[PDB]
């Protein structure tokens, strides 16, 4: 089956720097969009969604358009204390009637030095 790996446990960045949050899929089946959230529960916050939405200070590292692609890493600009937390990379499934969570990475703890 598809496994979602985020190799970093902790990422420590300086206030104002951009942080790279790294994530890899091992398969391409099942098809569906990757999404990034900060936090794990139903209180989680959408950080990025491949399918839909404009997330003005996130860039993808690779190009997610081209099928064959398996790098779901992201860059988030101008990190501040407000951005602190734990970022999960999350595979969704299918589509109809809605996208359904399938698999999630272990999580990358982002923080800021003072």
């Amino acid at each position, epitope marked *: 089956e598809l496994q979602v790996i985020q190799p970093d446990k902790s990422v420590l960045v300086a206030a104002g720097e951009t942080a790279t949050l790294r994530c890899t899929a091992t398969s391409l089946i099942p098809v569906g969009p990757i999404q990034w959230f*900060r936090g794990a529960g139903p209180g989680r916050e959408l950080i990025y969604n491949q399918k839909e939405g404009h997330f003005p200070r996130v860039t993808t590292v690779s190009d997610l358009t081209k099928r064959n692609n398996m790098d779901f890493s992201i860059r988030i600009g101008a990190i501040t204390p*407000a951005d602190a937390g734990t970022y999960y990379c999350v595979k969704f499934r299918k589509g109809s009637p809605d996208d359904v969570e399938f698999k999630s990475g272990a999580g990358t703890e982002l923080s800021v030095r003072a």
Partner: antibody
Amino acid sequence: DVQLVESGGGVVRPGESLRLSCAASGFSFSSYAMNWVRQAPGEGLEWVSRINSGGGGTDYAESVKGRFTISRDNSENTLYLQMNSLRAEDTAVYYCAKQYDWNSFFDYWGLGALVTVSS
Amino acid sequence: ETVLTQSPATLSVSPGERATLSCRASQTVGSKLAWHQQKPGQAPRLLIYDATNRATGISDRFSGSGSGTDFTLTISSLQTEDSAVYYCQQYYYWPPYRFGGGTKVEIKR
């Protein structure tokens, strides 16, 4: 372009309930956190509540806690504010507002719906 | 919570002159400062975000400057249509949804 259009306001009696709705278009409603922000006659703007993208995560100013419920419908692109046990100091123009990012400034404001509470 | 001191409370500017509004944070807010305009009896509109960037559609008469704790909004060639209240909003710390006290701008005579 992005449009935020509130409705459901008017005159209500103290102790009545009232549902504001904000109809959203010109963007991907499900990808943003949404807020309600109110303004009493001649006061500063007062943040009332916020909601997640997914709908399961909700914060509320302490002046409305226990009495106000925020919720949303991603299918229909609509924000709600349920307001129970209303009283006279809840009289204001209530605006819906979009965030740029989940932890950022307000991108867009609604037209705003007036809510008068009076016996 | 970061304290945002907007100042002065009211500012009078004669028609055509520059108007200079200040907002000051209790502790550093980096670049993450946004300015809104609310004309009487309308909703607010975003003018400036990221301390210095104009929003889409906004006039070049409105400009933002500063970093850290001290910020400015500058209105170049003041028209009667700029009579309004202006609020600052920081989003460097969680939570973003607090405002300064606002600064009312009125035409000096």
